[PDB]
Amino acid sequence: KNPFQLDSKAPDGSVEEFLMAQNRFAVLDRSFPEDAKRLRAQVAHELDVRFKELEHMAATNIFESFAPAGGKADGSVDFGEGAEFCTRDDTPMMARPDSGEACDQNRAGTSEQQGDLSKRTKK
Amino acid sequence: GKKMMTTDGNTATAHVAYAMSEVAAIYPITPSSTMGEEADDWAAQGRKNIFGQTLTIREMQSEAGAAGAVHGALAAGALTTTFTASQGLLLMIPNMYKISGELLPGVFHVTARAIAAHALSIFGDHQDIYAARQTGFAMLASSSVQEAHDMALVAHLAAIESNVPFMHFFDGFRTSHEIQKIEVLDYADMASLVNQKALAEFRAKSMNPEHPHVRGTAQNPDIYFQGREAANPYYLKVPGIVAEYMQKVASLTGRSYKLFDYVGAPDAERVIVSMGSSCETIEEVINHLAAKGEKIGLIKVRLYRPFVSEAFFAALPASAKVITVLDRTKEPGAPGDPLYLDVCSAFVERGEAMPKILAGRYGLGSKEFSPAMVKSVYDNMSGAKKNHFTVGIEDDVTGTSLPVDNAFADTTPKGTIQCQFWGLGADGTVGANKQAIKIIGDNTDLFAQGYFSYDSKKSGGITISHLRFGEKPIQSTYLVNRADYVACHNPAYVGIYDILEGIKDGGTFVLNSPWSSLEDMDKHLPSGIKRTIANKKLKFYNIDAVKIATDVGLGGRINMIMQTAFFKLAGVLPFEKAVDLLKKSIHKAYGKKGEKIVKMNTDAVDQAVTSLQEFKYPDSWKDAPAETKAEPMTNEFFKNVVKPILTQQGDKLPVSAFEADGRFPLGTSQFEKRGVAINVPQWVPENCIQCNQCAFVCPHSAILPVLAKEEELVGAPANFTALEAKGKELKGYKFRIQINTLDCMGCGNCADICPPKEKALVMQPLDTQRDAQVPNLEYAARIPVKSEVLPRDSLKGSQFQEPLMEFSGACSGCGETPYVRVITQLFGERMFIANATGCSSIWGASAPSMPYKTNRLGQGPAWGNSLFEDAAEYGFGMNMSMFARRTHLADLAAKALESDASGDVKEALQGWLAGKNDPIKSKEYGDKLKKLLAGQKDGLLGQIAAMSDLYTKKSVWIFGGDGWAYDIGYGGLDHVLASGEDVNVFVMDTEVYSNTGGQSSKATPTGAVAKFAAAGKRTGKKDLARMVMTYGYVYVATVSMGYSKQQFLKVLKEAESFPGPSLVIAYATCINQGLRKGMGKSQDVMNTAVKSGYWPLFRYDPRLAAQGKNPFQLDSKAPDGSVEEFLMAQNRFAVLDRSFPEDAKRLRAQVAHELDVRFKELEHMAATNIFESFAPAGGKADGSVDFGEGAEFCTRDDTPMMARPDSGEACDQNRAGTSEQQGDLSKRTKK
Amino acid sequence: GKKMMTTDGNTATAHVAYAMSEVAAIYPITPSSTMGEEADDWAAQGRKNIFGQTLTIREMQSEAGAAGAVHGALAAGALTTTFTASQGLLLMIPNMYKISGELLPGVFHVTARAIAAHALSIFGDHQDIYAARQTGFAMLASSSVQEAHDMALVAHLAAIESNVPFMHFFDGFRTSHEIQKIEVLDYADMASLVNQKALAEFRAKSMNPEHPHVRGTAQNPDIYFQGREAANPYYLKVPGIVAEYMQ
Amino acid sequence: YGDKLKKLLAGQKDGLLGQIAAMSDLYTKKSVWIFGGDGWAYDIGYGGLDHVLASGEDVNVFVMDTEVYSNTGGQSSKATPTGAVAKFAAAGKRTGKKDLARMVMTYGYVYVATVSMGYSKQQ
Amino acid sequence: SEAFFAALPASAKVITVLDRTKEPGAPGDPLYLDVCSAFVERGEAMPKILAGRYGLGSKEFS
Ligand SMILES: CC(=O)c1sc(CCOP(=O)(O)OP(=O)(O)O)c(C)[n+]1Cc1cnc(C)nc1N
Ligand SMILES: CC(=O)c1sc(CCOP(=O)(O)OP(=O)(O)O)c(C)[n+]1Cc1cnc(C)nc1N
Ligand code: SF4
Ligand code: SF4
């Protein structure tokens, strides 16, 4: 089922009275009447759009699964375990107790390129 | 009981921390990362703590988050620990006050690292731990790997009994990454030492709704001071508790400690007080010198907080007449560093004898602190007695340094074998050195020590191993400077580095090279080396490690041969045992895939032992002909500063060589020319379709397209082949794809993507290419770049622009640098870069290699690294500066328009004001102004003329990785984008904390394997793009070079031109992801990332809504079904499949499901008809009004928090009800 | 000229800070809030600083954000200031090392407030300013409403000429909120005390693509220590400079 | 079941049962709540709030949105709406309210809701 | 320190350094530690130095 549910209804048109009933809004109307008029209209439009977007969310049939947890099971593995090329650099930042073992550091090109160079330079 | 073990300071302390803790909140930071990672690994393997439980570990979004979680965990009654350093410890400070203030038994294990000031440093010193000395945490220092283990245990036990949190610390790298054979206790023994009554008291006083209490109250002046002093009893007792546990632990281990310990002559007259790993080297020197009659000693500081002066004096010989206190930090402006001030206080309070006390600074950022330096310190006490000195550097600026005599005799105990190994990154030298340390330590009574110096270069970097083996304890916490055995595993080093420096007489020198014949050696081996080998009668051995490896089938892989060389010639073990042990271990390790890969190594050993014969050299080497100096031309700065640094001589540069503020100039990497690629591309002009994709894609700017006119090719070398230029606009020009073979890293991305079947680029060995291309690139570099020919932001055209970020220390095939290189080609000359700490800042600016450069006109990115957590705000600040200063400029312009300035000037000003924020017009008129106002120094036109670097519209960019953007700096990123100001954020998503060693980030995808997500991350990838899109006024887009270079460029232009905030998220391949066919497949992987639907490309452009059109546009097509092969082609996913096939199948199916859903969501977004569209901006107008002006009721409270200068007027405070209720009561009461 | 006015420590300080700064990144925290709010109201009212410009002020998400913004503004050549205390000051510490480390003329005005330990307190003491004593910022104290005005000015003038960031502080409430009849200087008088050459030099060395440089490098053991000691000549001149401006 | 263990184990001091008896304040499942204002949730504490919600653990965040930093004196926050007057928004805030709710809903596995007592006590 | 001493009367026999903070476990608070170091480096007269804590959280200092 759709996880999103709308519990209130579309703007009933009383927003202007709502704002003007609070000094945080009204005080602007008394000091910068032109800007205030503009901003209260901007608020009205912002909410109009938002509500419309919430209505789509509520009417959509597109949403994803859910599961509290589970799976993992004992054990972990290093991301570099059995990789074909180095997964760490020559930096002291990536240095670790178990690092230091030789690997393909990508300075000889791709596997395929390396393979083809072998084929061509065979001798 | 006990157990022997060879490990580093990190695992030594993590070993105890895991046992003594139930919870751990962590965050990765070098050099402490190892601890948290081991804790995670052990918990996953099933290791139990003293309570029989596996540790509950969690990675937070930052260290501030970990500190808060640690506080909560402790408050809620769970023993808790954390690991951190430097910048991280700083973020924990606010919570430290709370954790100690609330008397919680927490324990922080800190690898002391330098704090970033004039520069960032990951190396060790005590700046960080001293920054927290006032938080109320007890502080216990350990000075050796074995001490790290012991003090970690004392800290925990003492924290539990005392109720005072503890910070156990040890020196970054010098102690944290040094390997030593030590002894560790079983968890059961640790458990037996725990005070059970205290543990139960902790549990009972903790937060719990069954018996609640209130904590974290807000207090007024009447009681705060009393409440702050009520913990005194606890701090008075902690010292005795620490001593008690030092004693209990000693009865189990045999190693005793005191809050302050003394070593040396009991009648010493000159004493040193120090803390940390320096104490080990100091003691070693005391043994040597005292044996010659010198009356010197050392007081080792264990418990630094609380500072118990009585224990200090218990360790001070009454005979001491001069005392030098060593501080491993710098507090600018303080009358002295912390330890020094603490000691001084002890003497004044004692009020008796006052010996001469001197203060000394050493070891900042892991600066060497060697025996010679210790000698300097001791000599100073009997000589000049210079005060507030520095040692380890040459301070020729203020003259605070002690001179250091490097002829000082070797002081390692009798019978110590010292080794040095010069390797090349990824040649397995370090891993071989570590094996030899385990092998030797496990099979002898010898003490072993290993330490490793790495390179700032991530690829093809040089490594230097320092190993010591001996019959006596190894206290040498400094590099080996007089080696018995020196091995140079890379022949390229022979002619460029001072490899035989300090090697002893009759010492053994092993070299890996194909110079078997005396004529070959004479041919390649330089004179200095020959004279050194000859004059010191060195046992010189040469061995074609590459030929044997190939011959036995190991395919040129030299680790085993050089390993055999060590075991055979180092002389720490007898031939027999060594070869035996080495082999037994070869079957031990390996042995996995048949005895075929076992035989090759066994064989490689046998063959190595045979080929390992003492090369014989003619006595004429004694005075070989000193060669010349065939060194090319470069800058004075590259000659005097960076060259010296790149060749391991930075330690000799005095203070005078550096800028007070730490700045460096751009383009110093232009001259490095390392030439470490094994294979480089070869241009085949017959097959070239002149598309420029190869140059666009290069992670290192190694490809230089050339567009010349006949006349420019005149002196062109014969082999400077050029095609007639294809393209209507290029009619008449000659085209060429010039390969820069020395700067190439040989990743193969260019060749891999070159369009035509009959490739125009083919990888060939560096040798087959350099002689021809070195002179060619050098000729081409002098050919003017044709930037005016084609559109700057067109695929082909962009490559005809000057790249302003070249030859960085990024890994070969790095997925971040191509993006950055292109961005500079489009805005480079007018951009600011606020770079978050991370790979981009590391390849971006690791001294002394500076990859960002200026163009032919001297313009280039103004680049800066503030911190890891504040890049967005840092760039926002740069944007504030430009706004302020360019507004000042605009105001002067407007004023000047109303003066008698000439019509020309006025016309230019009017033009600039009108095009002020337009890159084209602001530059056009600004350029007229530089001309017109040239020379003007008086009045208004003068000020305006002096502000020319502000004329053209600048481009502020914020560069950062995913860890920065989705985690630690997300709050700042979110606030900056929400500001609506004109900044550009470019996020290089590598889907992990790359630079620090592949730790998971909220950007890490479901099922991906990474540190702290080693069973595959179990939460989907955070959707930063969709979160930012909810704003409606921020331009948001995603890109992937491999999929579309055009969409990338389109995004770049649309984001930068957006007059608001822009966020661009790019798919960045990285070595941590483990691309199965190499990093040269990066472009193809980027391509697949998009096609598979794994990484959809889109753009959210607010200005489209401003015109009735949908701001959201999808740029890629629905998932094509290839995700499974896309994931299986990366080890970060493939490993999980091989280890947990069941859950891995499930996790990969979940990814395919998530992306399918997400693509469908993006689809309705593009199909929608609803979107934010009102007015562009408008408004302002001078004036301010207070939200409380004219309110009918009080709008502020009676609190001190809301009190303001103008507050205090009478008002209706809502205690009589509504206006109506009061009205009605008025009517009802009439009267 | 001089001007007699009755106000509190906060306003006496903000009066100077506004005049001597071009940019300010702020975040609210008692008892320093008054200063930022004042600087904001004045800017919105069109008050001009010594450059005849109204102040560019923005509110960040936290003090850490504020401190990062301050660092960036300074790095990019603007005279910058911020107002904070206690918990906020602590979050600015990481950036304080960077700001003093790159020798930037920043000025922090702090109303010294207690740090939250066994409890939170919005009241005054030096717990917060002492927590930042190793960051490399010069630290100048004022002990009265009148001194708050004078030291604030000395702090700004001295930061510009010395290139060492300054932390001007006074007691939370006890001074920040005490009201006294004092004398403040006109903006013109302050402007005449400014070292025009140091100022031009600060702007010439700042970040700019027209003449770039790299700042905030990552350094190894080979050179970090020398690099950290390179600023000594600047700290050596600070005392003399403060004394000169006090005079 | 926890209450039954309190009676059945009352007095137990030894071994396993004793250890279990001493852990009764852990028997009942607890409800972990995080309280804070909009300034905390939308600004300074946002990054930690975001990280903790993304963790998937069982915690409850309750945000009392006053659309300003109230305690400190009415300073604007990212939760402050368009046109509202507040300190640092002296001419009415010129950017709209940050949509914290829709941002958090993008995870899909976090429960998100908005309330308003005056409109519906039941909701 | 030079400026500190230029302000200290040569007659001073006892000096009390008042710190308005508390660093738990420190051998002394910041100003006190700084003053102590001043006397130690001078090497001359050593008057009695006393450390005192006051005014935390706006506590009256009357
Ligand atoms: C040098 C330094 O201390 C780095 S490098 C950076 C890696 C971040 O990765 P991101 O995904 O943002 O970028 P990437 O490397 O390209 O993957 C971290 C964790 N830090 C360590 C760290 C931790 N915590 C804090 C406050 N500061 C720092 N500097
Ligand atoms: C008392 C204390 O120091 C408070 S009261 C609080 C206001 C928070 O507002 P919010 O909207 O989240 O909640 P509200 O009050 O219910 O509106 C602030 C900014 N702080 C000051 C502050 C500033 N900066 C920092 C790091 N810490 C603190 N404690
Ligand atoms: S192989 Fe890689 S580093 Fe070399 S030119 Fe090609 S893209 Fe650049
Ligand atoms: S990618 Fe190939 S075809 Fe294109 S310009 Fe480069 S060498 Fe020529």
Ligand code: SF4
């Ligand atoms: S992002 Fe990855 S590939 Fe690039 S420099 Fe960093 S570790 Fe290397």
Ligand SMILES: [Ca+2]
């Ligand atoms: Ca933009």
Ligand SMILES: [Mg+2]
């Ligand atoms: Mg990353």
Ligand SMILES: [Mg+2]
């Ligand atoms: Mg609020």
